[PDB]
Amino acid sequence: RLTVVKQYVDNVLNKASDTYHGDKPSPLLADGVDPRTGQQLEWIFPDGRRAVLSNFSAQQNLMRVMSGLSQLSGDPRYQKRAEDIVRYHFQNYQDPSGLLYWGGHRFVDLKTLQPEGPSEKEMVHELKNAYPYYDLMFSVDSDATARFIRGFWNAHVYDWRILETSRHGEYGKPMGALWESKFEQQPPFFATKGLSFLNAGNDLIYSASLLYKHQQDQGALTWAKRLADQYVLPRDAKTGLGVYQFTQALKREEPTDDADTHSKFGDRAQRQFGPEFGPTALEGNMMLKGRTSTLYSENALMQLQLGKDLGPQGQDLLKWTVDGLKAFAKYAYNDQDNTFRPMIANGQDLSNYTLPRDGYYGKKGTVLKPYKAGNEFLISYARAYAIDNDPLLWKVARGIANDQGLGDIGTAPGKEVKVNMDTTNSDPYALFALLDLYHASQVADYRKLAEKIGDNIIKIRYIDGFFMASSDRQYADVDAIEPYALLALEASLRNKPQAVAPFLNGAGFTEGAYRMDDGSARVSTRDNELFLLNV
Ligand SMILES: [Mn+2]
Numbered sequence: 001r002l003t004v005v006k007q008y009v010d011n012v013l014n015k016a017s018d019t020y021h022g023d024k025p026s027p028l029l030a031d032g033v034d035p036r037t038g039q040q041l042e043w044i045f046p047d048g049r050r051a052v053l054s055n056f057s058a059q060q061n062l063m064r065v066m067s068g069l070s071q072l073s074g075d076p077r078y079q080k081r082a083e084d085i086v087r088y089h090f091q092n093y094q095d096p097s098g099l100l101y102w103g104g105h106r107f108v109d110l111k112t113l114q115p116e117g118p119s120e121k122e123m124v125h126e127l128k129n130a131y132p133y134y135d136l137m138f139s140v141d142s143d144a145t146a147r148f149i150r151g152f153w154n155a156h157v158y159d160w161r162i163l164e165t166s167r168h169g170e171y172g173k174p175m176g177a178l179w180e181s182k183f184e185q186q187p188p189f190f191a192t193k194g195l196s197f198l199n200a201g202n203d204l205i206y207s208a209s210l211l212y213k214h215q216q217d218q219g220a221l222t223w224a225k226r227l228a229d230q231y232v233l234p235r236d237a238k239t240g241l242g243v244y245q246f247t248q249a250l251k252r253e254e255p256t257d258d259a260d261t262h263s264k265f266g267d268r269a270q271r272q273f274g275p276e277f278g279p280t281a282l283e284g285n286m287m288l289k290g291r292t293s294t295l296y297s298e299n300a301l302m303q304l305q306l307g308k309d310l311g312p313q314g315q316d317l318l319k320w321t322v323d324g325l326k327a328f329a330k331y332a333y334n335d336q337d338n339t340f341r342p343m344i345a346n347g348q349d350l351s352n353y354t355l356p357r358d359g360y361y362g363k364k365g366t367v368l369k370p371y372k373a374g375n376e377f378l379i380s381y382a383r384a385y386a387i388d389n390d391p392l393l394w395k396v397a398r399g400i401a402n403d404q405g406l407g408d409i410g411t412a413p414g415k416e417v418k419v420n421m422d423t424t425n426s427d428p429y430a431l432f433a434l435l436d437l438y439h440a441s442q443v444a445d446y447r448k449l450a451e452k453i454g455d456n457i458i459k460i461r462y463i464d465g466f467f468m469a470s471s472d473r474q475y476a477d478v479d480a481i482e483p484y485a486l487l488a489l490e491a492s493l494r495n496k497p498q499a500v501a502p503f504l505n506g507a508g509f510t511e512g513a514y515r516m517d518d519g520s521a522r523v524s525t526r527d528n529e530l531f532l533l534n535v
Pocket residue numbers: 104105122126167168511
């Protein structure tokens with residue numbers, strides 16, 4: 001499997017590289033390549049100008065694959081290129097504020113080597129569950145990395161007193177008080193005009209924690225953990241469930257219209273569920289599909305890993321994260337059909353609940369149903385189990401695996417195990433989870449199963465020298481996690497627990513106006529959509 005990954009990365013470096021500057025290329029890479037033509041995936045601007053999309057925030061799995069490949073193979077070329085790419089970004093694409101030209105609304109054109117902004121009214125910095133490889137960055141340039149992290153916090157915190165964050169960060173913003181800002185803890189679900197989204201807080205928690213890890217910065221650690229704790233303090237006193245957000249809308253006006261869901265009318269959950277469920281029916285307490293993926297996977301996996309790695313400095317973080325996942329398993333999970341039940345954090349089961357009025361969560365008449373636990377829950381629950389072997393976390397891992405065609409991992413590790421060695425499962429996430437189960441239990445069947453998945457990944461997803469989700473896909477994504485999974489499998493088998501970075505499920509995206517072939521503008525197009533297109 002190591003030879004395949006080496007082949008693959010060689011292929012990426014051959015076909016995704018800068019071919020626009022003759023014999024003096026930059027080290028930068030295209031995000032996507034059509035494996036049939038070698039054509040690099042382009043952003044098309046309103047006038048028909050074509051940029052080759054180089055978004056460093058959409059390449060941070062590849063940086064990990066590259067470093068992992070070097071550690072396992074002993075070939076230092078891949079590690080060196082990853083380092084060269086970091087160095088070139090600090091040299092050319094880092095603002096005086098410290099922010100990089102990357103993320104949701106900026107990238108670099110590989111052709112011109114100039115920064116781009118595909119969304120003209122949003123020339124801004126955004127990171128959404130990106131989880132960049134700061135370990136590598138600190139290794140290249142510790143000071144420049146620290147400047148990025150301080151500038152990230154400075155740009156994305158609107159009000160330090162109450163920790164109001166923003167999804168969008170302005171470039172060129174002067175340094176404020178930063179870690180020396182005054183904080184005062186507000187009560188659960190205080191009413192405010194702003195909104196600290198969890199998928200904007202995730203990258204803030206992760207970055208400030210890594211600045212602690214590398215520079216022993218007490219200010220960074222304090223604020224990282226304090227921000228994490230904002231989604232913990234308002235948790236339900238009985239159930240320990242929640243919360244998706246920790247504020248509610250400031251009500252300035254009485255509503256006239258169920259279907260007008262503007263925040264000025266007040267918390268949208270209190271409007272639609274409040275009459276029947278009481279004052280605790282609030283947006284942050286709505287444990288619904290998608291929202292629970294953000295809370296109990298996107299956030300939780302990262303906090304689990306941080307809690308562990310922070311050691312003496314992460315005990316509280318880790319406690320909050322494992323306690324939250326345990327509560328969700330206890331209250332909402334159904335292992336028989338592998339579903340989570342829709343709920344309010346106070347413990348109210350909304351399964352088969354008909355919405356009695358229009359609102360933010362659906363039109364009158366909609367029946368709320370249990371939803372299938374996707375593999376983002378498999379990786380968060382298997383990671384949790386690896387740190388704290390609780391039967392409640394096993395329950396979820398077991399239920400999902402069985403629903404994924406993997407057989408029965410047992411009533412507990414090594415007990416009544418009946419895994420399916422003929423599985424056709426080729427999911428990187430399944431591979432990742434099984435490795436965590438193995439490392440917690442030493443039960444050999446779990447790793448034999450992961451080997452099988454790895455073999456399936458190569459047989460069905462290694463295509464034309466790339467990794468693709470389908471054989472018909474137009475463009476391959478150089479940030480594919482298939483080789484990342486294969487590497488962690490190989491590092492387990494070769495007895496190298498330090499060679500490959502624990503998985504955080506980060507990813508990048510690019511969002512803006514994109515010109516269609518007929519010349520029309522498609523507003524808020526994402527590279528995610530481009531990668532789903534077939535030939
Ligand atoms: Mn945005």
